[PDB]
Design a protein around this nucleic acid. Structure first.
Ligand SMILES: [Mg+2]
Ligand SMILES: [Mg+2]
Ligand SMILES: [Mg+2]
Ligand SMILES: [Mg+2]
Ligand SMILES: [Mg+2]
Ligand SMILES: [Mg+2]
Ligand SMILES: [Mg+2]
Ligand SMILES: [Mg+2]
Ligand SMILES: [Mg+2]
Ligand SMILES: [Mg+2]
Ligand SMILES: [Mg+2]
Ligand SMILES: [Mg+2]
Ligand SMILES: [Mg+2]
Ligand SMILES: [Mg+2]
Ligand SMILES: [Mg+2]
Ligand SMILES: [Mg+2]
Ligand SMILES: [Mg+2]
Lengths: 98, 243, 76, 124, 239
RNA sequence: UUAAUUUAUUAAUGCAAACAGUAUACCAAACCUGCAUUAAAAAUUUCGGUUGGGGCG
RNA sequence: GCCUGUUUACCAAAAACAUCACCUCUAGCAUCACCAGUAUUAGAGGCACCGCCUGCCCAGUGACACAUGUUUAACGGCCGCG
RNA sequence: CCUCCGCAUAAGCCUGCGUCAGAUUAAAACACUGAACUGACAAUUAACAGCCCAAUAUCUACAAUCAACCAACAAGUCAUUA
RNA sequence: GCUACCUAAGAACAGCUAAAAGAGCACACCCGUCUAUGUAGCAAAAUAGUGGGAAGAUUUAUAGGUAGAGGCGACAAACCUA
RNA sequence: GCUAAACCUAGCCCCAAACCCACUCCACCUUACUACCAGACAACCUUAGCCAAACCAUUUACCCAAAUAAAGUAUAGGCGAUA
């Protein structure tokens, strides 16, 4: 996502009013691109045993491409939401016993 | 001479004049909402006052948005809240050279999505911001039911939202029979939602679609005067009869 | 092989129907009720046939259900 | 410049424009293959005239005729003078049913008959 | 700018079809190619360039008998009416192909070579090395697109494990799959090189307007460029 | 035009994003998006003064 | 100036532009032009039928090769003093 | 006395020298009364020419030039069946 | 709707010598070399004589297409409603 | 004394107030003013420039939320014309 800041400083129009723009407030300056960023990884809770990226039950951070293309559409994982976190740790609490 | 009302109020006057008045009131509120979108193509200011350099005096600061342009392909598929940035550029980032016009188009992708409520696989011309937002919202269905009308920036999104809200409001035979417990589970999952049935139909319409829908509601080919007059006549003879 | 039907002179395929016809359990609000084209959407029309047969607008049945159809070919 | 203001009649264009225009006469048939015109006798209007033989009513009126107030006929008046005695009478005998109004002259739908009123089948 | 193309005929027919000239004008109406238009009128003879297509309900190799060798206006090499079985079709004609002759349309890719005539068409796997060929495809069952003009011919160079390498008349080599059919011999109407036009009237008869008169100065490209022959073009797909 | 500014546009490249296997290594198919370079084609603008007329000096 | 022909409608019809002939460069290819064509082809150009010929040069520019190269029917150039 | 004109079709215009009345006036480059007009009245009558074809498949290689020899290139202006 | 080019389907070219012919004389037609009149003229480009072509790269009737940062151009920086 | 000269009144302008109109019958998107038949194509896009800076190359008020004031202040600007 292309992020741009405005060169030329729009002059602060009111509280209950809209800012009045001129054709010099159409001049932009690229402050960042959101590609060319070090891509973070997302967290998933697995429902099935898979290859070396994990086993069933434990959450794992994998690359966004792998987790969005293979693990989530094929039903191998669930989003690491706080809701299903509770049922998964409860199933861990009932699988491993006293 | 002068108009009585200003030119920018004729739209609301047209809403109060005719068949547009007979639309339901909650649709009229949702049409006259006029709320601001979340920032997409700019970084908003943190505070309301920002002490600046070269004089240590606090100044008010507002954040004004970017006038971003959405083509019709943004209406065909779920983009982010992002579109094209039609703007201008000084050549080598100094203002003493030429001023050139620049268009920043987003990067588009074609990925398949699944919906748990509609039980269908869609092909969408998604971007990367929508993928990140769906990941942040823990599902396509939560992303469409969650994000407001101003932030989808798509009519396909509002159609999907009205479909999901109608499915939630009706409690319909959703998935299929031979599995009603899965129906109860999926309907229980998205329960922090589900406006009434008569309010779910008017979600995400344009003004023209709502005008046509309300026009089709009161279509009503008229009643012949024979039935009206025989009703009046038999009422008069019953009135003269019982006395 | 080299097909002889140039794409520009062939019958164009219709535009893809608007996306409201993929959303299940939802009926679209289209211009069939006003009997004239507008923009903003498009309906799907049922097949039509003439109730009363007309000799100036008659359409033949297809060829393998003509009553004189034979499988083996004759040569006139 | 050509003559803009005078109206566009059938006498004006080239040899193909003449003939395609016409003057407002309602056609009575169709053109077949060999440029023949086939008249259809059910399309040409048949004048329905009566016999005026023993008729006693002139194109003018005598001035000795008295005057009266004008009253344009209204649908309530036509209902009252046409159907209201019959419905009143057979309601007094308690045999009136709101279910079948067709026996008093009401028609549920115009699709059956020859002189249907709202799409106006008949000419004049 | 109503420009509907004249090539609108969905059924193959032997009959000459009326064709409209274009004058270098594309669909918008502006000129795209200069110096074309306004010749003698022509009609189009639909050539069948897939030399091996069997008739309907027939499968194997089939024979054909030549009927006439005409003059086609729409190309350089003249064409031949060829009849066989229960249909007729126009094909491109080769040198020394006259009427009444019988030509073969083969599919069988043999173990050894086949000593073939100057008319018939075999797949490239069955032809002997060094044979002069023409009307070659680039894919099996595409149609003849390369060598077709008058008196031009390509030589088959070598046969490798699953391909055969062809030398076009531009001398650039091109390998193609082993089952691609190609006809044998040079295309008809040699001495098309030796045609003298004679006058500017013939160039107006052929449908070519004269060159424009603005003097252009030659730049850097105008010298004689001695280049190495371009690398071989491969239509064989590899995984 | 070999005058100043620029590449808004196309064509090439390189990097990034996007996809996939791959035994501590390599390969990066095609199309869009951003950035950087080169070229083609262009866009805006200018073309000082004194001068026993102007030009040359 | 090879010829027939073309042009500054309204002051210039020509020795000017085109023209058959010759030569240089670009392109291995399917459907809307080129083309329903395929290197005896198509396009960008110079010169101007024919007859005798078209001498030398890649220093520079441009183009092509990236093997310091190839290219002048490419832009162009083909000496000085005693 | 002239005729290098005229009669028609197509294209274009639309009543624009047919009758009566006014001619006191008005345009006739002057006048009579009529091509540089006013009002009223009345005509152009189709067989000539326009305005056309029920479908689905299928068929249509041998120019024209008295079309008969001869001879060609720029390769052509006309067809059906179930 | 003039004009530059193109597309669709058409039309015209007496007579003589025809060497066979983008051939010769020469009508109709197209163009406009020279002279004279005219210059608020018949005409915002004509008239009279004299000329080139006149079976072709010809002329022309109808419809359509290419439009201005452009169209088109046998390059006249020619034409695009005087 | 001929040509001539003279006229008041149609109407119009600027405001206030108030939100304003549209089928008698027939015809009118094809060659509009046409009674009557089978491909259904369809809209959403930063204004630019003259001009001022005595040239000109960044720049130059025009943007539709009532007034007055803060105030032509803080600010921006080949820190300059000006905004
Ligand atoms: Mg304030
Ligand atoms: Mg040439
Ligand atoms: Mg030249
Ligand atoms: Mg001076
Ligand atoms: Mg001086
Ligand atoms: Mg000459
Ligand atoms: Mg002149
Ligand atoms: Mg001329
Ligand atoms: Mg002259
Ligand atoms: Mg010359
Ligand atoms: Mg030389
Ligand atoms: Mg001649
Ligand atoms: Mg002559
Ligand atoms: Mg010309
Ligand atoms: Mg010149
Ligand atoms: Mg200035
Ligand atoms: Mg000044």
């Amino acid at each position: 996502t292309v992020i741009v800041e405005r060169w030329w400083k729009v002059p602060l129009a009111g509280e209950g009013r809209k800012p009045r723009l001129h054709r010099r407030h159409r001049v932009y300056k690229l402050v960042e691109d959101t590609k060319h960023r070090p891509k973070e990884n997302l967290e998933l809770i697995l429902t099935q045993s898979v290859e070396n990226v994990g086993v069933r039950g434990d959450l794992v951070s994998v690359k966004k491409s792998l987790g969005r293309n293979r693990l989530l559409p094929q039903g191998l994982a669930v989003y690491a939401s706080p809701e299903n976190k509770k049922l998964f740790e409860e199933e861990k609490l009932l699988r491993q016993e006293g | 001479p002068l108009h009585k009302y200003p030119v920018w109020l004729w739209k609301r006057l047209q809403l109060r004049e005719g068949i547009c008045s007979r639309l339901p009131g909650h649709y009229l509120r949702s049409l006259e909402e006029e709320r601001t979108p979340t920032p997409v193509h700019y970084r908003p200011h943190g505070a309301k006052f920002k002490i600046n350099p070269k004089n240590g005096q606090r100044e008010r600061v507002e954040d004004v948005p970017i006038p971003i342009y959405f083509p019709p392909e943004s209406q065909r598929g779920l983009w982010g809240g992002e579109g094209w940035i039609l703007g201008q550029i000084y050549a080598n980032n100094d203002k003493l050279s030429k001023r050139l016009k620049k268009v920043w188009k987003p990067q588009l992708f074609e990925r398949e999505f699944y919906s748990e409520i509609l039980d269908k696989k869609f092909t969408v011309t998604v971007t990367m911001r929508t993928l990140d937002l769906i990941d942040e919202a823990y599902g396509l269905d939560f992303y469409i039911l969650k994000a407001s009308g101003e932030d989808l920036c798509s009519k396909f999104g509002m159609d999907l939202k009205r479909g999901m809200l109608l499915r939630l409001a009706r409690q319909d035979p959703q998935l299929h029979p031979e599995d009603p417990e899965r129906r109860a589970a999926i309907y229980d999952k998205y329960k922090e939602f589900a406006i009434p049935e008569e309010e779910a139909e008017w979600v995400g319409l344009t003004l023209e679609e709502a005008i046509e829908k309300q026009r089709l509601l009161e279509e009503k080919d008229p009643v012949p005067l024979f039935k009206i007059y025989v009703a009046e006549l038999i009422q008069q003879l019953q009135q003269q009869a019982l006395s | 092989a080299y097909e002889w039907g140039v794409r520009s002179t062939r019958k164009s395929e219709p535009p893809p129907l608007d996306r409201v016809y993929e959303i299940p359990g939802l009926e679209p609000i289209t211009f069939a009720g006003k009997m004239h084209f507008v923009p903003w959407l498009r309906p799907i029309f049922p097949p039509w046939d003439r109730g009363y047969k007309d000799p100036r607008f008659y359409r033949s049945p297809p060829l393998h259900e003509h009553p004189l159809y034979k499988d083996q070919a004759c040569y006139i | 410049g050509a003559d803009r203001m005078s109206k566009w009649t059938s006498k004006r264009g080239p040899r193909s424009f003449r003939g395609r225009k016409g003057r407002g006469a309602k056609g009575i048939g169709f053109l077949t293959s060999g440029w023949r015109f086939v008249q259809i006798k059910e399309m040409v209007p048949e004048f329905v005239v009566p016999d005026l033989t023993g008729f006693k009513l002139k194109p003018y009126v005598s001035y000795l005729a008295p005057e009266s107030e004008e009253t344009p006929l209204t649908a309530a008046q036509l209902f009252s003078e046409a159907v209201a005695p019959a419905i009143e009478k057979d309601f007094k005998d308690g045999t009136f049913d709101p279910d079948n109004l067709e026996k008093y002259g009401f028609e549920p739908t115009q699709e059956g008959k020859l002189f249907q009123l709202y799409p106006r089948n008949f000419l004049r | 700018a109503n420009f509907v193309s004249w090539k609108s005929r969905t059924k193959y027919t032997i009959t000459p079809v009326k064709m409209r000239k274009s004058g270098g004008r594309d669909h918008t109406g502006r000129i795209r190619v200069h110096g074309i238009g306004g010749g003698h009128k022509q009609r189009y003879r639909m050539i069948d360039f897939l030399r091996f297509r069997p008739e309907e309900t027939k499968s194997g190799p089939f024979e054909e008998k030549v009927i006439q060798v005409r003059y086609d206006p729409c190309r350089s090499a003249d064409i031949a009416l060829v009849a066989g079985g229960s249909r007729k079709r126009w094909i491109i004609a080769t040198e020394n192909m006259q009427a009444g002759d019988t030509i073969l349309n083969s599919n069988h890719i043999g173990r050894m070579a086949v000593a073939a005539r100057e008319g018939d068409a075999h797949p490239l796997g069955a032809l002997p090395v060094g044979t002069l060929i023409n009307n070659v495809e680039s894919e099996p069952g595409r149609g003849a697109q390369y060598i077709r003009a008058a008196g031009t011919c390509g030589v088959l160079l070598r046969k490798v494990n699953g391909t055969a390498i062809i030398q076009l008349p531009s001398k650039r080599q091109m390998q193609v799959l082993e089952t691609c059919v190609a006809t044998v011999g040079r295309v008809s109407n040699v001495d098309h090189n030796k045609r003298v036009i004679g006058k500017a009237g013939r160039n107006r008869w052929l449908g070519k307007r004269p060159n424009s008169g603005r003097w252009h100065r030659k730049g850097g490209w105008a010298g004689r460029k001695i280049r190495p022959l371009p690398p071989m073009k491969s239509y064989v797909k590899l995984p």
